[PDB]
């Protein structure tokens, strides 16, 4: 019988997703899950999120092509430092990629080009969207006083239940019910990582929604007021910020009384303000692009 080699899985603005991309990220996420010990759900729920990530990636790649952004070979050389984890394992060749694709070179190099181009255009657009006000910087700096108040550092897992920019009340209550159900499951004992892989519109869904270690002030504010009162492992109910309902889990926390001795505090405060602004504008702009873009999943 004839064997299907490749096919179009999704149609986007003048682009197509091939089945050799869904499978690649499927194997990537399965391998990461196996190394991370975190069990992952059934073929279809994992497939929907991978397809969504690929639609968003294709949209961003076509925007980069339209806008005349290209990547240098030295950028690939630098990405070899972290993308291939050469610093952790001392070997240059593609024999480290033992899992799948037969240790091929071109495939992983193109994958890295895909990530660098997405990151570059994402950064450029989000940076061009940021507005900084001197008053806010002064306020945040004066907040950064009294022995570096709120020096709490957090590693958190996040889940986003999306809503369109102009949603209907029907959609509002649907999203509300979904978010409350996820929150109830998380609070009742369900593993948040498994919930995050199954139920999430964020880019980090495929990674389980982990945001990594950060500082509370870096939060867009929508999370910090609720988050100041929470212990390790707690589940925070649904919130809003324009892009949909938000759910947060406190994976880990670590605090210390270190104080940096303003001359050097203003620059740091500007850094954290830029971090929060980038995180919020990135989420808003990625949601806007998803709503605007043309797409027709294929089956």
């Amino acid at each position: 019988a004839p064997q299907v080699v490749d096919k179009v899985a999704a149609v986007v603005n003048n682009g197509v997703v091939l089945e050799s991309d869904v499978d690649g990220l499927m194997q990537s996420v399965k391998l990461n899950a196996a190394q991370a010990r975190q069990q992952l759900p059934d073929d279809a729920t994992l497939r929907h999120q991978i397809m969504e990530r690929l639609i968003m990636d294709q949209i961003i790649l076509q925007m980069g092509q339209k806008m005349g952004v290209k990547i240098s070979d030295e950028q690939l050389d630098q990405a070899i430092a972290n993308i291939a984890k050469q610093n952790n394992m001392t070997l240059d060749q593609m024999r480290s990629r033992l899992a799948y694709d037969g240790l091929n070179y071109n495939t992983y190099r193109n994958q890295i080009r895909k990530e660098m181009i997405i990151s570059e255009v994402r950064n450029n657009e989000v940076r061009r969207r940021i507005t900084i006000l001197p008053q806010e910087v002064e306020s945040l700096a004066q907040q950064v006083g009294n022995q570096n108040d709120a020096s709490t550092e957090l590693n958190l897992s996040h889940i986003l239940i999306p809503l369109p920019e102009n949603p209907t009340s029907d959609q509002v209550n649907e999203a509300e019910s979904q978010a409350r159900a996820i929150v109830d499951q998380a609070r009742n004992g369900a593993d948040f990582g498994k919930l995050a892989i199954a139920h999430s519109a964020d880019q980090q869904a495929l990674n389980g929604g982990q945001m990594g270690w950060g500082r509370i002030q870096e939060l867009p504010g929508i999370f910090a007021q609720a988050l100041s009162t929470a212990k390790k492992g707690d589940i925070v109910g649904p919130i809003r910020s324009g892009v949909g309902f938000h759910i947060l889990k406190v994976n880990d926390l670590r605090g210390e009384s270190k104080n940096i001795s303003d001359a050097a505090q203003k620059d740091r405060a500007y850094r954290m303000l830029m971090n929060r602004k980038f995180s919020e504008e990135a989420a808003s702009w990625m949601q806007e692009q998803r709503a605007s873009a043309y797409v027709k999943i294929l089956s």
Binding site: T131, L133, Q135, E165, P167, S169, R240, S241, G242
Partner: protein, 371 residues
């Protein structure tokens, strides 16, 4: 030729509601022919328990707030008969301050009638049709003419203190934005979609910032008119454009804080940590002030041309084009009550002050609503 060939059916039906109270009409008084079918800004004005109302030709009338009894009436339509009896084409709405009653006119005239009996203290010619509602502040009377010119008439004698030019697009929506007092400044809209701030002393522009997306193809898709009144609260300016974004801006720097695809030409309300809004589609909504998140929405009145909302007795009130007044709970979109007031539609904004709600129908009848 044929009167049975053109019609579009896009009007919502009258919702059914269980009124928690019984709306009542304390009194009603006829004021001339009224606004009529023309789109105008004319509406009553409440000052020291006196109700001042006007007419498109001009019938300035003062009525008691308690029982709508009048204390003095005058007509500004060719008092001396310079040419027959031409209409004054009043469309500025009644403004009341310092014993003076300021009214605009589409003949490019601004009248400053007296409070004691209506004697025209002064009348000043302006750059064009005074469509905007006069704004009295710092001894000045600010007008925004239809040809895109902000003028600041002197309160005492009506002399033009200064003037500022604003860009005018090839097409716009009828009406003009009324400036705001702010702090020694004037925050105004514009038909080009750019909100501007001008110092009160002279016309030195302080800042200007675009508010409309205006990503259209033809003129009708670039209607970026800011015909609302910018609202200043704690140093942030709230503005709202037609087919544009509801945005918040720094009062002095002018940089936007946040934006939301929501458009309207009706004045909104900023109360506490909430923003009550009526969109261009007649969709009553409630948002928060720190960020745009639509706290709740109501669509039962969609495409029923509504007036701007007013906060009264702790609930929101809106009129409609069929003469029905609707009460809405602030906490949620549920209707609190509904009433029939007039057969002619309600177009111009209601007035809610001193524990009293007043409205004016298209036919010119001033109504007082109580309980």
């Amino acid at each position: 030729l044929f009167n049975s060939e053109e019609d579009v059916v896009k009007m919502s039906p009258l919702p059914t509601v269980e009124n928690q109270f019984t709306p009542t009409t304390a009194w009603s008084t006829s004021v001339g022919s009224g606004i009529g079918n023309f789109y105008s800004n004319l509406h009553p004005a409440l000052a020291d328990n006196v109700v001042y109302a006007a007419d498109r030709a001009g019938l300035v009338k003062a009525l008691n707030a308690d029982d709508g009894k009048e204390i003095w009436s005058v007509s500004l339509a060719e008092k001396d008969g310079w040419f027959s009896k031409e209409p004054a084409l009043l469309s500025g709405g009644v403004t009341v301050s310092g014993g003076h009653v300021y009214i605009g006119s589409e003949k490019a005239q601004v009248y400053a009638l007296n409070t004691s009996d209506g004697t025209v203290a002064w009348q000043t010619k302006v750059a064009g049709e005074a469509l905007s509602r006069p704004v009295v502040s710092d001894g000045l009377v600010l007008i925004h003419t239809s040809n895109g010119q902000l003028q600041a008439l002197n309160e005492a004698d009506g002399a033009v203190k200064w003037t500022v030019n604003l860009d005018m697009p090839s097409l716009s929506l009828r009406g003009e934005s009324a400036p705001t007092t702010a702090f020694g400044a004037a925050v105004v809209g514009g038909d080009n979609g750019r909100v501007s701030a001008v110092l009160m002393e002279q016309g030195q522009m302080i800042w200007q910032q675009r508010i409309s997306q205006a990503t259209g193809s033809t003129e009708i898709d670039r209607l970026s008119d800011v015909d609302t009144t910018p609202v200043v609260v704690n140093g942030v300016v709230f503005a709202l454009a037609y087919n544009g974004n509801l945005t918040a801006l720094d009062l002095r720097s002018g940089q936007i804080m946040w934006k939301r695809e929501l458009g309207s030409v009706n004045d909104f309300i900023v109360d506490g940590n909430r923003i009550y809004l009526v969109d261009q589609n007649d969709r009553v909504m409630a948002l928060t002030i720190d960020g745009g998140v639509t706290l709740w929405t109501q669509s039962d009145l969609l495409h029923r041309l509504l007036t701007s909302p007013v906060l009264y007795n702790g609930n929101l009130v809106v009129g409609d084009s069929e003469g029905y007044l609707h009460w809405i709970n602030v906490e949620d979109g549920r209707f609190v009550a509904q009433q029939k007031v007039d057969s002619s539609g309600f177009q111009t904004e209601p007035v809610a002050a001193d524990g009293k709600l007043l409205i004016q129908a298209k036919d010119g009848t001033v109504y007082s609503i109580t309980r």
